[PDB]
Write a protein that binds this ligand. Structure first.
Ligand SMILES: *[C@@H]1O[C@H](CO)[C@@H](O[C@@H]2O[C@H](CO)[C@@H](O[C@@H]3O[C@H](CO)[C@@H](O)[C@H](O)[C@@H]3O)[C@H](O)[C@H]2NC(C)=O)[C@H](O)[C@H]1NC(C)=O
Ligand SMILES: *[C@@H]1O[C@H](CO)[C@@H](O[C@@H]2O[C@H](CO)[C@@H](O[C@@H]3O[C@H](CO)[C@@H](O)[C@H](O)[C@@H]3O)[C@H](O)[C@H]2NC(C)=O)[C@H](O)[C@H]1NC(C)=O
Ligand SMILES: *[C@@H]1O[C@H](CO)[C@@H](O[C@@H]2O[C@H](CO)[C@@H](O[C@@H]3O[C@H](CO)[C@@H](O)[C@H](O)[C@@H]3O)[C@H](O)[C@H]2NC(C)=O)[C@H](O)[C@H]1NC(C)=O
Ligand SMILES: *[C@@H]1O[C@H](CO)[C@@H](O[C@@H]2O[C@H](CO)[C@@H](O[C@@H]3O[C@H](CO)[C@@H](O)[C@H](O)[C@@H]3O)[C@H](O)[C@H]2NC(C)=O)[C@H](O)[C@H]1NC(C)=O
Ligand SMILES: *[C@@H]1O[C@H](CO)[C@@H](O[C@@H]2O[C@H](CO)[C@@H](O)[C@H](O)[C@H]2NC(C)=O)[C@H](O)[C@H]1NC(C)=O
Ligand code: NAG
Ligand code: NAG
Ligand code: NAG
Ligand code: NA
Ligand code: NA
Ligand code: NA
Ligand code: NA
Ligand code: NA
Lengths: 649, 644
């Protein structure tokens, strides 16, 4: 049971610093700039259409002492304002780069940016030779490289952190940074980008506009994931093509029985999750997985729910436990259900419902108490879930997410559920929707109620979400607007901002809380327990095996109040079992089934597919080893990919 | 100036009726059902996707004494819940028809509807043999006839007010009622409606599914407006086709020359918006003849939202021929334009009365669907009604970002010709009593307890504190009827975590105690863009005169604000004519001028398969304009004896 009253109020009251901002208009954004810099930026923005020239003044405040004091530096951005859609363009964590993209209050020949490379302590002003259509994008491999699309659909690039800009191509519809500062972009065949569905050209430049190469024609769309480049190509019908050499060579995606709607759910250096819409136009599709070449796919999960307008799904990478992914499917009776995989798409199981839930006490029927974990599918469906599932690799096994059972009331007002074993087991910890953040690599989790009333409570947990305490951080409740944490692995600082509205005018205020005094002592051996990740194959020899590697994790004991949450850790290999294999091309695991079985339609014919112009023949026991799985010994089904020395089809 | 003296708080306190609702979950909707019936329904709904089966219980409360008392009748809809997207399917006014379309808690073979034809005083339940994909639709000619699309894209029709249903066609994408119980609908050949865009077939049935007729192929979309049927056809580019004979014959829209949208259409005329070639967020409004075929330039640089295509186009239903929308000025300022002759001529909206004005823009922008789609803080579009002649209430902003972020509420009493800022900040508002009562409620994050009301058509406002426990505002609903005096406010308190819902019904009967006398009215004429005295009071060639309650009036009006007069027609002038095909009116200009690119070549268009030649002075009479005499410009459509 939880430890009642380790007194925190005194240690938090003296570490809570309020700042009132007078006469702020528009939306107010707050952000920490850097780890251990002390810098917090507060900026007001305005919702103004791009084409409209209007007058306005954004306000800008800066703290250099961790939120205790703010200096008005609006004079730096005199006679400009920033649109809410743009906000701040903050570079990578250790770069110190911040860019404010603004519009001149009276109008001008182009936009105006304010550039800082010292954690927002000094800005320089630069007039753009164009009006930005969207926010400027940093190159992932070089924060000095910026690209921006103009309102004239021109592609502009800067090599020196936005100081000097050059237009490298006109009539561009979409542009994206690839790897090693490559730029991919689409261009017109004629008039409008909207009217030219399926007739765009995909272009590549590897030297920031000096030379170009057309890598695709008749393009519907394109995207990037992991080491893979994807393009939807119009033949009257759409097919998916994959490239792992930045478009020099393409191969059509090979799916058993490339369709009208596709989506890359996730992709890394090892594999691809691909969603393909079911024939006709229903609310569900199918998840396919590929090898590290991104070409040959196999059926992974049926009836995967997606929003027909936008393609969002509940697909969630559980980043706090290797190999774990969660998403939502439509059961046979059209109930929503959360499925979870612990082997990177090889096998999926129903998410387990909490034991002895309040739902179990009132449910007049089973399956009513199934737990649906809310993500982008719920959010796009306009449900009241203010945050997707939250996890981070440093906080091993911790997942925080909104969830609902099979009641309309629960769907309307989700609750916050906590998992400490990467999603295998869940407990309802907070009533109603919340905003939440992880600090101190999981040593501190904080949540704030999301409702119509003004709030004055911080809820926090120091034992990975098992026990919660409430801290009244003000006597004047605020309509909550934002929650922002200082970055860093050992973070203790968090800022809340919002406003009072006793009459018609909003008075904005920020509260910065330092949790330094709460976690005084360092955890010892009796403060932890040990746990092994869940395995779907039975046997003590298979407990704790993740993709062929057995490992052991710690977990803070319930009611713990201590720091030094050691990094959860000698590697050992497991024997091979079914959980270490995906189904092969043409095979699948029926719902609730452990073994792969050949899809019925292919039972008659030989399994063949196209691989870079060469037709291949597949003989298989129905299995192929999961990319990245270091399994050895045990079960080893056989497969052979024989080249037929023939052109495709 | 306003008369603050008549103390109203005593006359309103005894006429304010509170009802507290226990354990309401989900979204809460409230609606009056019928003129002088006394019926108010309160229903809880849930935001749940269509395909998902879940458990839930909607709650249903009914008042039969004008909101003083509510009876829990949830048992009527036991074991069902209603989706927020569906709500209630309310038949036409005075029909008495209400239908609650629900799904069964836990799933079933089809939906379940609860049907009433006596203003929701008695319901009967019917199990549907299908799951409805969208809300059921009443036939405008017969409220017993219903239409519904199933989640399997089957087309279902009922002839007996939803008691018995028949499936008349499968694989249907969209279906709509025509004028005489005709049904137009599109169907694909195989697969998906999304994938078969531009390859759909447009079908018609005039006998509720007994027989069908294919009236269009290669269809992208279709729609109905006024007496016009529209279809978008995929050729290499998409173009719009019009039919005035229910699809037996079509004609392509003839524009002097891209994406096409129908802004509005009635029995006389079509408003068409045409997107610029490069998609820069603005387009051009074109107007048609009475056939919907021949179009001419009406308004340039018409702003539209780049994704949904919404514009600020607003029909001022309280004054004939008046429309307002937003355009992009030469320096990319937003501006409101107004027409008093149904698109013939547009003028800049006049600056608000009594204002202190720097920049070039103290101009007043009236907020509508373009502002709403641009995510501005505008909770309601402009509000007007035909019975409340000349009254328009709308959100407006001047040309500073602060004003755009927090618009104010403006009042016009002459159909939008002149405007005054009457309320600070965004509000919800409603008109009842044919304009005798206007009510407004603040839109903000804090709970409210004040009702703002006007009894002189918006010229003077008073504040009434209707409760000591402020509520987070949810809705404002007025009793229907020309002489209505009751409104309902509902919302919830949330002192802790739980919402407690409550309704407040206010009766203005004691406020408007005495009846207005002759000294309570003034008379006015609608604005005319031609300055002659022979055109005073002329609206589209027809003379009329209006009344208006004097400022600070607190009395009940029983007269139609249109004075009863023998009808008289006006002489023709420029305001009575559109520009002809190939002509347009420059900004602020009264006379039409030929578009420059066409000044050299012969004006030609295709009309019913035959190529036609147009010689014109630049004008054509506005469709519906009852003008006679006066100006008579010449035009001739000469057949060229050629196919097209
Ligand atoms: C789902 O989220 C997890 C966690 O973020 C992703 O896993 C991580 O992916 C990165 C890059 O692929 C891995 O980095 C690698 O780092 C190691 C060690 O420095 C290096 O030897 C490799 O060459 C590689 O650069 C990282 O280790 C890995 N972390 C874990 C816990 O697996 C995963 O990629 C996501 N899934 C998908 C499909 O994207
Ligand atoms: C969380 O926020 C707190 C502030 O509320 C941070 O603590 C502050 O850190 C600064 C910089 O390390 C400390 O300043 C230093 O003082 C020494 C002399 O003692 C001086 O040489 C340095 O130049 C600097 O001024 C400051 O004292 C300290 N304030 C408090 C109240 O502890 C803290 O670093 C933040 N991060 C974490 C992880 O807690
Ligand atoms: C995987 O396992 C689950 C059980 O854990 C299987 O679920 C079952 O699904 C059927 C529907 O396919 C449920 O059935 C019946 O539905 C009818 C409606 O037509 C209803 O009238 C009956 O009362 C009944 O509920 C059944 O209840 C359910 N079983 C359980 C224990 O929940 C699922 O089908 C399996 N998947 C595969 C591919 O085999
Ligand atoms: C606004 O709401 C009030 C109630 O707050 C409505 O007043 C009520 O209307 C009915 C019908 O006129 C009245 O009831 C009965 O009328 C019959 C005559 O058919 C009579 O014999 C009964 O004795 C009874 O009065 C009811 O008394 C009346 N007023 C009140 C205060 O209860 C009113 O009709 C609503 N609408 C308008 C436009 O004011
Ligand atoms: C714009 O609003 C007005 C007011 O509703 C419409 O005018 C009426 O049209 C109906 C149906 O044709 C007639 O029955 C009424 O007699 C008209 N009333 C008035 C005051 O004109 C008008 O048709 C609407 N739509 C368009 C496209 O203008
Ligand atoms: C910029 O702001 C200053 C206030 O410091 C103001 O006086 C000045 O007019 C502005 N400059 C321009 C060019 O508008
Ligand atoms: C509501 O419906 C359920 C299922 O039909 C039934 O068991 C229950 O008795 C009903 N409640 C009432 C009050 O009739
Ligand atoms: C058009 O008329 C308005 C109102 O009289 C005037 O203010 C404006 O300057 C005119 N516009 C142009 C472009 O001349
Ligand atoms: Na870098
Ligand atoms: Na951009
Ligand atoms: Na009445
Ligand atoms: Na049902
Ligand atoms: Na009809």
């Amino acid at each position: 049971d939880c430890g009642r009253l380790p007194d925190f109020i005194a240690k938090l009251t003296n570490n809570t610093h309020q700042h009132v901002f007078d006469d702020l208009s528009g939306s107010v954004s707050l952000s920490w700039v850097g780890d251990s810099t002390g810098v917090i930026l507060v900026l007001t923005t305005f919702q103004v259409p791009l084409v409209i020239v209007s007058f306005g003044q954004s306000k800008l405040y800066r703290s250099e002492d961790y939120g205790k004091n703010f200096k008005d530096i609006t004079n730096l951005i005199n006679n400009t304002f920033i649109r809410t859609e743009f906000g701040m363009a903050i570079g990578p964590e250790n770069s110190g780069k911040v860019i404010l993209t603004a519009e001149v209050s009276g109008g001008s020949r182009g936009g105006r940016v304010f550039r800082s490379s010292d954690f927002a302590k000094n800005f320089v002003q630069t007039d753009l030779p164009f009006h930005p259509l969207t926010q400027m994008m940093y190159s992932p491999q070089n924060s000095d490289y910026l690209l921006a699309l103009s309102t004239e659909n021109g592609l502009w690039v800067s090599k020196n952190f936005g100081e000097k800009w050059e237009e490298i191509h006109k009539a561009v519809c979409l542009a994206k940074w690839g790897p090693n500062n490559i730029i991919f972009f689409t261009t017109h065949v004629n008039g409008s980008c909207k009217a030219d569905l399926g007739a765009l050209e995909l272009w590549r430049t590897s030297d920031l506009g000096k030379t170009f190469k057309t890598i695709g024609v008749k393009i519907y769309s394109f995207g990037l994931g992991g080491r893979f480049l994807f393009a939807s190509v119009m033949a009257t019908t759409r097919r998916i093509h994959v490239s792992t050499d930045q478009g020099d060579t393409w191969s059509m995606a090979q799916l058993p029985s490339q369709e009208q709607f596709y989506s890359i759910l996730a992709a890394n250096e090892d594999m691809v999750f691909m969603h393909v819409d079911e024939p006709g136009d229903t609310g569900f599709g199918t998840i396919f997985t590929s090898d590290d070449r991104g070409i040959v796919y196999s059926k992974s999960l049926d009836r995967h729910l997606y929003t027909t307008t936008g393609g969002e799904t509940d697909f969630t990478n559980v980043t706090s436990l290797r190999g774990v992914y969660i998403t939502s499917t439509l059961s046979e009776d059209n109930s929503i259900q959360s499925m979870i995989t612990f082997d990177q798409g090889g096998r999926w199981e129903h998410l387990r419902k909490p034991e002895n839930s309040k739902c179990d006490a009132t449910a007049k029927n089973k399956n009513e108490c199934s737990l649906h974990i809310h993500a982008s599918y719920s959010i796009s469906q306009k449900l009241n879930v203010p945050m997707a599932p939250l996890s981070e690799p440093n906080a091993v096994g911790i997942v925080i997410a909104h969830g609902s059972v099979g009641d309309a009331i629960s769907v309307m007002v989700p609750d916050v559920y906590i998992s400490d074993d990467g999603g295998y087991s869940w407990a309802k910890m907070l009533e109603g929707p919340h905003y939440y953040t992880i600090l101190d690599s999981g040593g501190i989790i904080v949540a704030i109620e999301h409702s119509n009333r003004p709030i004055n409570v911080i809820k926090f947990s120091t034992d990975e979400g098992q026990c919660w305490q409430s801290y009244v951080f003000t006597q004047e409740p605020i309509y909550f607007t934002g929650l922002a944490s200082e970055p860093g692995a050992r973070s203790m600082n968090i800022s809340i901002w919002g406003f009072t509205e006793s009459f018609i005018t909003r008075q904005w205020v920020s509260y910065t809380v330092d949790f330094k005094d709460i976690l005084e002592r360092n955890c010892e051996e009796d403060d932890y327990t040990t746990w092994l990740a869940h395995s779907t194959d039975p046997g003590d020899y298979k407990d704790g095996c993740i993709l062929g590697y057995k490992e052991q994790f710690l977990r803070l004991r319930k009611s713990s109040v201590c720091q030094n949450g050691r990094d959860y850790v000698q590697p050992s290999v497991c024997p091979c079992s079914l959980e270490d294999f995906l189904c092969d091309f043409g095979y699948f695991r029926p719902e609730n089934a452990s073994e792969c079985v050949e899809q019925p339609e292919l039972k008659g014919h030989e399994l063949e597919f196209c691989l870079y112009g060469k037709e291949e023949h597949l003989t298989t026991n129905g299995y192929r080893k999961i990319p990245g799985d270091k399994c050895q010994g045990g079960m080893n089904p056989a497969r052979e990919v024989k080249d037929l020395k023939k052109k495709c089809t």
